[PDB]
Design a protein around this ligand. Structure first.
Ligand SMILES: CC(C)=CCC/C(C)=C/CC/C(C)=C/COP(=O)(O)C(Cl)(Cl)P(=O)(O)O
Ligand SMILES: [Mg+2]
Ligand SMILES: [Mg+2]
Length: 516
């Protein structure tokens, strides 16, 4: 049981303590949960139940029932159950916006002072109201000034009252929210955390809790078999024995679980995790290991998709390059075989673009150039690797793939570009880079520059949120990938890192949840 050991990882998937009795039980519990979501309940209680389903990682199992139940509730006119109740108003606002039902920010106007625009100080001791308002605020869009105020107000109040909470469970939840709001958290990681918290909630539904545990374990058995296959692949490539990129495979896979955790997306997940392992490896090639001439050759080979001069590179750079080449061809081929469309031109292209972006960073370094923040981000949203990961994910999942469709996603329209910019700046804040560039450009202090970059995180999120209520040429699951890579970034770049990481990996991928 060591997350970093490939003997152990390569064995993962041989045995599973998940039975076909477990699977039958799960089928029966799923049917009762489905009935609870669709069945009668008071509306607030129903919202709280649907929120709990989502938090336990189960929205993927019940999305239709959840949307149907919220639609019913949204079409009420009977509104006495929420109007003037901040907790109810805020929960409704969030779950409706999350599920594509618009609610205006002015539902919160009655809790403001009509003069100052400040929220009323009488809210300062409604903990659950403040919490729900804080969580809701992250569903806001650009220009929704009441929600911006709601963030700053609820953040300051929750910080003030955290230590005054009596309920240990509510206190843990508030602490958790102030670290990251729910909207920014990675689904699968939050699910493992929330199962334990939910078990201790007073309103806890034991049927739902039991289903959540069992489903978690069943899903986890697919992940273990994936990890097995990926670790055997990775050891097959020899790249585990490289100087650099210690733990790159399992780091990549843990990030991939943030992007997409569902069992039916297992083959796509494995291919994203391969690409990710290669991104982090090759990034080290370009950042730490290769000479400028070696990197120029690596980039030119990739740009031409032509490995004739590959032997000019030393072994430790030639191996990563050929593995990138072979895996890119494998993934494009999968698209041909499974989806009807040869994806090799698109995997080659995004790798070429990414190495070009690495090459530009290496040239800035070598020549002592200080880019502006905009100049840096234009390149760095590519170098972070998410255009590569996201275009690949689209290739593998879009229905009826065409050159026209792949060309559009590969051109990085705003929705996609927002995601890539976020992943880059979140990574940079988690510590050349965003903050220092903005410092160089404006003379700001570190503190002020960091606040600026944090503001950019909030702004790009608002743009993501809004892009989600508008019609898109994109569908599920790509729509979810695009959000969930950002949540993955937040989760792994909060500011011992080793033991926190290992604990997440062990608790989410390695140890099952004990069932009585
Ligand atoms: C969703 C998915 C499968 C992610 C795979 C892992 C990937 C490639 C994460 C990109 C973010 C990572 C792990 C960056 C760490 O690398 P760094 O060298 O610090 C850099 Cl931030 Cl890339 P940079 O080289 O710009 O300094
Ligand atoms: Mg690097
Ligand atoms: Mg780099």
């Amino acid at each position: 049981a060591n997350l970093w050991d490939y003997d152990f990882l390569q064995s993962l998937g041989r045995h599973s303590s998940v039975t076909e009795e477990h699977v039958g039980l799960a089928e029966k519990l799923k049917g009762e949960v489905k009935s609870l979501i669709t069945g009668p309940m008071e509306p607030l209680a129903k919202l709280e139940f649907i929120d709990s389903v989502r938090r336990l990682g189960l929205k993927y199992q019940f999305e239709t029932e959840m949307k149907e139940a919220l639609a019913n509730i949204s079409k009420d006119g009977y509104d006495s159950w929420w109007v003037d109740n901040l907790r109810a108003t805020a929960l409704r606002f969030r779950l409706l916006r999350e599920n594509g039902i618009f609610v205006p920010q002015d539902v919160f106007e009655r809790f403001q002072n009509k003069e100052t625009g400040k929220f009323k100080n009488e809210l300062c001791e409604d903990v659950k109201g403040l919490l729900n308002l804080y969580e809701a605020s992250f569903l806001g869009w650009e220009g929704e000034d009441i929600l911006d105020e709601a963030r700053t107000f609820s953040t300051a109040q929750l910080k003030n009252v955290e230590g005054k909470i009596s309920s240990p469970n509510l206190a843990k939840i508030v602490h958790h929210a102030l670290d990251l709001p729910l909207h920014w958290r990675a689904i699968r990681y939050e699910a493992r955390w929330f199962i334990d918290i939910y078990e201790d909630e007073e309103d806890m539904n034991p049927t739902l809790l039991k289903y959540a545990k069992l489903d978690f374990n069943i899903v986890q058995s697919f992940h273990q078999a994936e990890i097995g296959r990926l670790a055997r692949w990775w050891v097959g490539t020899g790249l585990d024995k490289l100087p650099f990129a210690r733990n790159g495979l399992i780091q990549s896979y843990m990030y991939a679980i943030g992007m997409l955790f569902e069992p039916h997306l297992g083959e796509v997940r494995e291919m994203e995790a391969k690409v990710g392992a290669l991104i982090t490896t090759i990034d080290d090639v370009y950042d730490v290991y290769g000479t400028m001439e070696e990197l120029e050759l690596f980039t030119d080979i990739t740009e031409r998709w032509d490995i004739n001069r590959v032997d000019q590179l030393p072994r430790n750079i030639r191996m990563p390059l050929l593995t990138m080449f072979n895996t890119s061809n494998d993934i494009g081929y999968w698209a041909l075989k499974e989806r009807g469309f040869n994806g090799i031109p698109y995997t080659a292209k995004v790798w070429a673009d990414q190495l070009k972006s690495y090459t530009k960073e290496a040239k800035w370094f070598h020549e002592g150039h200080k880019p502006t923040l905009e100049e840096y981000l234009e390149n760095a949203l590519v170098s972070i690797g998410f255009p590569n990961l996201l275009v690949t994910s689209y290739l593998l999942t879009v229905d009826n793939p065409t050159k026209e469709k792949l060309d559009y996603v590969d051109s990085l329209p705003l929705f996609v570009r927002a995601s890539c910019i976020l992943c880059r700046i979140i990574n940079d804040l988690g510590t050349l880079k965003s903050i220092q560039c903005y410092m160089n450009e404006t003379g700001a202090s570190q503190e002020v520059a960091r606040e600026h970059i944090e503001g950019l995180v909030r702004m790009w999120w608002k743009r993501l949120n809004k892009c989600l209520f508008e019609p898109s040429p994109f569908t599920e699951p790509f729509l979810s990938f695009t959000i969930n890579v950002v949540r993955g970034s937040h989760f792994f770049y909060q500011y011992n890192a080793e033991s926190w990481t290992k604990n997440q990996g062990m608790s989410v991928l390695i140890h099952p949840i004990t069932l009585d």
